[PDB]
Amino acid sequence: SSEFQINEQVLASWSDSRFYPAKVTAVNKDGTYTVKFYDGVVQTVKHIHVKAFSKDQNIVGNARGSRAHSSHLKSKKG
């Protein structure tokens, strides 16, 4: 399965700098996202800070993206 929604994987800009994998916890049509990083940290952020694990484009707040993947993550991801 490669369809991303609430309780499923996204790339979100971690407080460190840029994208890391995270679990969606909410999304808002206004243009915002709430995500939980697996380390145990939660925040609300914008579309400009979160996208699908598909590197190219978003597939929830906007629908231009398609099935793909990404090439940066934390080593303890599993």
The biggest beta sheet is recorded as: 5 strands, antiparallel
Order of helices and strands: EEEEE
- Overall spatial form: globular
Question: Which architecture of the domain at 1-53 would the CATH scheme give at its second level?
Answer: Roll
Q: Quick one: CATH class of the domain at 1-53?
A: Mainly Beta
Structure commentary:
It is built from no helices and 5 strands. The chain has a domain at 1-53: SH3 type barrels (Roll), CATH 2.30.30. The protein starts with 8 loop residues before the first strand and ends in a 27-residue tail after the last strand. It has a 5-stranded antiparallel sheet, with no helix packed on it. Strand 3 and strand 4 form a beta hairpin. The radius of gyration is 11 Å and the shape is globular. By secondary structure, the protein is an all-beta fold. 0% of the residues lie in helices and 37% in strands.
Key features of this structure:
78 residues; mainly beta; SH3 type barrels; five-stranded antiparallel sheet; transcription/protein binding; PHF20
Q: What is the strand and helix layout of this fold?
A:
Blueprint lengths: L8 E5 L5 E10 L3 E6 L3 E6 L3 E2 L27
Antiparallel strand pairs: 1-2, 1-5, 2-3, 3-4
PDB class: transcription/protein binding
Keywords: PHF20, Epigenetics, methylated p53, transcription factor, TRANSCRIPTION-PROTEIN BINDING complex
Assembly: monomeric
